[PDB]
Ligand binder design. Structure first.
Ligand SMILES: *[C@@H]1O[C@H](CO)[C@@H](O)[C@H](O)[C@H]1NC(C)=O
Ligand SMILES: *[C@@H]1O[C@H](CO)[C@@H](O)[C@H](O)[C@H]1NC(C)=O
Ligand SMILES: *[C@@H]1O[C@H](CO)[C@@H](O)[C@H](O)[C@H]1NC(C)=O
Lengths: 43, 293, 272, 246, 48, 246, 272, 43
């Protein structure tokens, strides 16, 4: 399964397990004051 | 010029080959009892059918075609690439590859797309060349280089249109070129010898079409006229020949009148009149002229 | 997150104070207006996958990287064929790779060698990887082809294409295709800066190939390099280039004859 | 926290920046007909999405010599969309409405408008004839203006013999160009019968009348339109038959 | 846009979109607009 | 206790005296779209009365030289009533159908009919031309006959190249004039997509073909019509927009 | 049910009220008259298997699907050879597949390439799968043959035939060979409906093949496609066609010259 | 046994275990009143 490598090195293997860690708020909302969803952005 | 129609319905030639370079011969039109098109059911012409093997178009197809000998490989009929079969205003078919198109301009897609709708779409925006491919396309442009991808064969670009099923709308990845001058109403014509079509020529002409074709030449002696195509079956619509110096009428053609094939006029300010009707519309005209210097 | 997103049932609101559709764009943030704080939606459970859109599945394509010629003539011959390893030669993998600033990955180079007119005769080749600092072989029978303390691959033309795994070998922590700086010190000219933007931590040696024989071989080979990325990590995403590439190792574009990002329309008040 | 609002009904949304609080007519929300007050037997239909959304009418330029406009709400959106199509096939009808009138300008324009609903807003004929044969009566496009609208002739008497000054007893709202640029009135179903035909009877009518004239200095913008949107909240229909036009 | 190039890399897409408009006029300039989306069917609408 | 039946849907009722048992297609009742199989986001509408009733089409006289008739069910009642009006405004559609075909005669007439549904009943062109330019294709009134219906040319091959003898694999029922005078088939929603347009795609089609000819002695009645009624069970609609014709 | 069916011992009945042989066919149901409610049977236990008659064992045959020519001339050559992937070209697999309305399965395409007169020279080929929306390659040395973000297979003629697994890739929930409808909107003609029955959710791109070389190759190849079905599910069984096929993507038949479903006999009162 | 796949995908395997679920009454007796075996179909 998944074609494990037969070598002493670790970079000669295939793609390892996937990682679904998106964390998209670092690009869409890069602000300090947490803007609420139902509110005005400016008071 | 031998074909004054968008599909080559009026082609009377003696090319008994499918192509002049690397082709297979066409079968005779009397040795074809197997297929529903032969002279045994269509005597006295009917598209042109005698005791020959010429590339005709009796079934209203997009291009002339003949019967090829079946070599147990399926196809028993091939399109005939006629080099001298192009209406004046048809530049030819060219290839279409990618992000740089042959015609740099506006595009339009439609579920009904004939030749004249795309020509009018390109003409209403003041473009010089029209173009369409794969049945649904309208590529306008004004660039002088539309052969940047190469010229393709005319048999390759015979995909059918969508609004009409007797006109070739190019092909998949192959654009067919046209001038925006054909099928319009009027134009300051000052060339040596051009052609004048009726409004909406690839389609039928609309109801209430009236326009003015002005013919001016820089000092020719006299002009020579001709009428290759003429098909009007109504007594209301009519073509006229006018003089613009003192506004006198030279000739009055009608649907019930058979016009001469050629005559002469010693003038250089010829005006063309065309009053349409609202009851019956069948086909336009393909007036070809020539000025004698 | 193995699937995309689910929608909760929504309803209508008739009251003052709550405005979800007035997200100010002056703040530099993206509008967080969802469907449930808007037109009345239903309850749908989405089972569409988000596995294919990952970086590891987006960069695991081979693509072409380099083409190396080998004339091997009789009187003006060369014998060997060096090729510096760089991926900024073919705009497809370069355009796919230059949408990030810093990357780090491993490679799976594959070598496909054919003949001029197309034929596979059983001639044995020798592919050599010369790291930076090792001497380049000069001649088809040079001293450097002994491959002592140097990795090489011996394969024929009739054999399947060779495939070797290359690790991450940059002296820095990651790769970078954009180096806003200068490699040296001192005074820099103003007329022709041929040293600006020269990526220092990107040179990876030179790839070499010859034919193992004694006298010669009247044949013109042409090998192609296909590099597959794996174990890749990307940082600082950059916008995708919209101009045609013009140079090998310098991002340039034509000042005149600029290409627009979109095609033209007839009018602004018309969708077709 | 109060001058901003986002009204979302169905697949539509209305965002604003300068708003007063919403006006709820007579303190009653639009609700479905209870079984105690009902009198029909056939089951009513409730689309709940395709007939419950903000339909936007046309805009009308507000000049200096403007008098005002009025509409009839179960008649304006009677030919446009799924609400109109559902109202032409059925015989019974019952729904509430959410209102929104847009009118924005700069901070240099002045003027004020009065938007209000009038239940059973019957149009009066204008004339001094008491004979039955010559007594003037309004036409069909005057009584039922349609999706376009109708103008006032004597907006001081509301074109009905009733003074405009006392028309503040109705559910109303002002559009003062120095304070806000929109006005919102939610109105329930007001009728003396549970269900009623949405073609031969308009329940109420919206009215926009500029009491303070529009004034501005030479150099500013001169096109000031009035835009109105309507949301048919809690629609019900019954008595399914062939589609009628009018 | 960036999402247009990302969707041009792939061949099939799903999910909802967002278009955010932004007014860059003066402070004293006011007004109202109607942004409308319409599913397929007939052509572009003629009137509002 | 079984040859009598009263089918009541909405405000309609069908009474009979000579009937077989009802045929339930593929053992599945028409049900509403579950949230797991759905793919749209907008809330669908459910009239539940005005679009759920027995619509009666026209009658067709069954002569001696008759070949048969066929319809397309999301196209027949596509212009008649609240179902058609609701189907012209929306883009998505999903419903089941209840069928009923009446054909009565005396105890001296003989003959038998075959009424059945055919999912994805595509009409075949008739001709011996293989060229793309002359290959015969059916017209729009042949593919979509409308509320009137279309006749067969070669009912032995179902006008589709498929033999009539094997057409008993579909949900079918016989009308034998010595046994019964009506046939009833209930059919659920059969499609490879949850929702679909009810204008550019007919799901299935009813077919009535007399295999046993109508025969009677001189002196009896000579007008034998075929009447059909359709009930759109469990109708749903979505994607509300302007009304289209076709 | 691993076996067919067992028969219980039966006997004779002489009594009124029970009639198992009078199943009315007007009800649309199949007669449920067994052997035990009829002529006196014995006790037999049947061990005959029903495993071979399943759908998964009925559709796991390869069969021929497409034939692609490759002329590769010298002056009027093309180089490439595209072939749109559809199975309605050969009436055997089409007749076997068109007895159902909705199907869903996976494919195991196998490519067998030979020469004109019959010979296997070691020329390397390149099979390319172009999905719908990707540009088609024009020329034997075109830009599309880089196969970046595009699956391709490199195999020779002397090698065994290639074999790739294709998943279920329809945008809908299942396939369908019968679409009683129209792909577009608007007005439809009455003379020639070339758009009726056009299956929208069936197009699966175009298959392409060329020869990897530099100049040319004076050879005329002819590759054959064999598609095996697996993991197949069928719905709504349809009757089997009894008329000869006439067109590629349209079910038609000859109005005159109709073929009967059975052959002719001398008389009806004669079994021979 | 049975040639299990060596891949990350699931459609690249061979035929899985068989399924003998016939359920043939959905085509032979698609009626609502359950007709008994020893009875008349019509009364
Ligand atoms: C075509 O016609 C010409 C007569 O002009 C004749 O000489 C020639 O042999 C013909 N060729 C064929 C193939 O029929
Ligand atoms: C067809 O016409 C050609 C030209 O005259 C002739 O040679 C040939 O014999 C004709 N064929 C038949 C069957 O009459
Ligand atoms: C017109 O003039 C040309 C030469 O000028 C002559 O050849 C031709 O026959 C003339 N036509 C007629 C109809 O006289």
């Amino acid at each position: 399964f998944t074609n494990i490598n037969y070598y002493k090195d670790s970079y000669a293997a295939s793609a390892t397990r996937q990682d679904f860690t998106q964390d998209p708020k670092k690009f869409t909302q890069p602000v300090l004051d947490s803007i609420r969803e139902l509110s005005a952005p400016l008071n | 010029p031998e074909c004054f129609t968008a599909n080559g319905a009026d082609y009377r030639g003696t090319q008994n080959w499918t192509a002049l370079q690397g082709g297979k011969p066409c079968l005779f039109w009397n040795e074809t009892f197997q297929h529903p098109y032969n002279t045994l059911k269509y005597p006295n012409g009917e598209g042109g059918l005698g005791e020959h093997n010429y590339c005709r178009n009796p079934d209203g197809d997009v291009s002339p075609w003949c019967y090829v000998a079946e070599h147990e490989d399926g196809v028993y009929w091939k399109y005939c690439e006629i080099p001298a079969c192009q209406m004046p205003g048809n530049l030819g078919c060219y290839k279409d590859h990618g992000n740089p198109p042959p015609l740099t301009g506006t595009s339009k897609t439609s579920n009904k797309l004939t030749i004249q709708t795309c020509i009018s779409f390109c003409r209403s925006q003041r473009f010089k060349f029209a173009g369409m491919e794969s049945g649904y396309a309208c590529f306008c442009g004004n660039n002088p280089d539309y052969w940047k991808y190469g010229e393709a064969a005319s048999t390759e670009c015979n995909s059918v249109c969508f609004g009409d099923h007797t006109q070739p709308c190019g092909g998949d990845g192959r654009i067919i070129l046209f001038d925006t001058l054909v099928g319009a109403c009027g134009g300051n014509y000052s060339a040596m010898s051009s052609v004048v079509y009726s409004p909406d020529f690839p389609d039928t002409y609309a109801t209430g079409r009236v326009c003015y074709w002005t013919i001016r030449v820089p000092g020719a002696s006299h002009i020579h006229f001709s009428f290759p195509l003429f098909d009007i079956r109504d007594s209301a619509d009519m073509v006229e020949l006018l003089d613009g110096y003192t506004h006198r009428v030279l000739a009055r053609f009608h649907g019930r009148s058979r016009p001469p094939l050629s005559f002469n006029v010693s003038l250089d300010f010829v005006i063309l009149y065309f009053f349409s009707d609202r009851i019956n519309q069948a086909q336009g005209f393909a007036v070809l002229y020539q000025a004698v210097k | 997150a193995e699937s995309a997103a689910n929608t909760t049932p929504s309803s209508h609101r008739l009251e003052t104070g709550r405005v979800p559709a007035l997200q100010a764009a002056e703040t530099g943030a993206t509008s967080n207006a969802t469907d449930e704080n808007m037109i009345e939606t239903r309850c749908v459970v989405n089972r569409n996958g988000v596995l294919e859109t990952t970086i590891n599945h987006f960069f695991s394509r081979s693509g072409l990287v380099g083409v190396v010629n080998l004339t091997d003539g009789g009187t003006d011959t060369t014998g060997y064929a060096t090729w510096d390893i760089d991926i900024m030669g073919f705009v497809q993998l370069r355009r796919k790779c230059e949408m990030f600033t810093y990357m780090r990955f491993n490679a799976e180079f594959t070598f496909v060698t054919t003949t001029k007119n197309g034929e596979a005769r059983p001639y044995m080749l020798q592919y050599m990887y010369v790291p930076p600092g090792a001497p380049k072989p000069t001649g088809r029978d040079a001293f450097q082809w002994q491959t002592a303390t140097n990795p090489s691959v011996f394969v024929k033309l009739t054999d399947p294409p060779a495939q070797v795994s290359v690790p991450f070998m940059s002296p820095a922590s990651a790769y970078q295709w954009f180096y806003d700086g200068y490699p040296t010190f001192g005074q820099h000219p103003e007329t022709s800066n041929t040293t600006y933007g020269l990526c220092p931590n990107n040179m990876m040696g030179t790839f070499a190939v010859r034919v193992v024989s004694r006298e010669a071989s009247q044949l013109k080979l042409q090998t192609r390099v296909y590099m597959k990325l794996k174990h890749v990590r990307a940082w600082v995403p950059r916008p995708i280039r919209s101009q045609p590439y013009l140079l090998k190792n310098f991002p340039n574009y034509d000042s005149s004859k600029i290409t627009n990002s979109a095609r033209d329309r007839s009018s602004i008040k018309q969708a077709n | 926290s109060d001058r901003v609002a986002q009204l979302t009904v169905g697949n539509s949304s209305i965002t604003t920046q300068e708003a007063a609080n919403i006006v709820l007519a007579y303190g009653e929300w639009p609700e479905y007909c209870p079984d105690t007050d009902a009198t029909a037997v056939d089951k009513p239909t409730r689309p709940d999405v395709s007939v419950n959304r903000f339909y936007t009418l046309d805009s009308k330029m507000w000049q200096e010599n403007s008098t005002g406009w009025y509409w009839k709400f179960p008649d304006v959106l009677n030919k446009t969309g799924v609400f109109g199509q559902n109202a032409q096939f059925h015989y019974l009808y019952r729904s509430g409405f959410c209102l929104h009138v847009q009118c924005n300008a700069s901070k240099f324009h002045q003027g004020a408008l009065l938007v209000a609903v009038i239940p059973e807003f019957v149009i009066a004929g204008r004339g001094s004839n008491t004979k039955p044969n010559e007594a003037p009566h309004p036409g069909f496009t005057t009584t039922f203006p349609g999706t376009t609208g109708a103008t006032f002739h004597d907006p001081y008497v509301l074109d009905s013999g009733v003074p405009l000054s006392q028309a503040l007893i109705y559910p109303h709202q002002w559009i003062n160009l120095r304070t806000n640029n929109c006005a919102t009135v939610i109105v329930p179903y007001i009728n003396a019968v549970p269900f009623d035909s949405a073609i031969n009877h308009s329940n109420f009518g919206l009215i926009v009348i500029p009491v303070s004239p529009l004034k501005y200095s030479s150099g500013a913008t001169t096109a000031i339109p009035i835009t109105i949107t309507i949301a048919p909240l809690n629609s019900e229909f019954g008595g399914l038959r062939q589609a009628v036009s009018q | 846009t960036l999402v247009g190039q990302i969707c041009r890399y792939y061949t099939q897409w799903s999910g909802s979109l967002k278009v955010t408009f932004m007014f860059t006029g003066s402070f004293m300039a006011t007004g109202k607009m109607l942004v409308a989306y319409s599913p397929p069917g007939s052509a572009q609408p003629a009137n509002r």
